[PDB]
């Protein structure tokens, strides 16, 4: 019981432990993407204006 449940628990815990990292990284990259779209559409806005 302790071996099998411990194994599956460690495995799924590793899964979530990774997923939170790519999640937060997705957040920071979402922020950089937000700035990118921001300044890009802003500078482009002068052109279309």
């Amino acid at each position: 019981a302790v071996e099998s449940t411990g194994n599956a628990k460690a495995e799924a815990e590793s899964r979530a432990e990774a997923a939170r990292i790519e999640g937060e990284g997705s957040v920071l990259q979402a922020k950089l993407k937000a700035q990118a779209l921001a300044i890009e559409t802003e500078a482009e806005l002068e052109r279309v204006k």
Binding site: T41, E42, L45, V48, K49
Partner: protein
């Protein structure tokens, strides 16, 4: 920002559109009036008579 700039832009192009259309409507109506008065207002009634 893009909906706003597009809004004022379209507002400008549209007011310009109704303006020019009003102008052509004016020269058209004036030309037609000058012609119909040049011809004789009652003569056309005789033409339809």
């Amino acid at each position: 920002k893009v909906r706003e700039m597009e809004l004022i832009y379209a507002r400008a192009q549209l007011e310009l559109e109704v303006s020019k259309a009003q102008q052509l409507a004016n020269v058209e109506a004036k030309k037609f009036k000058e012609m119909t008065e040049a011809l004789g207002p009652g003569t056309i009634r005789d033409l339809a008579v």
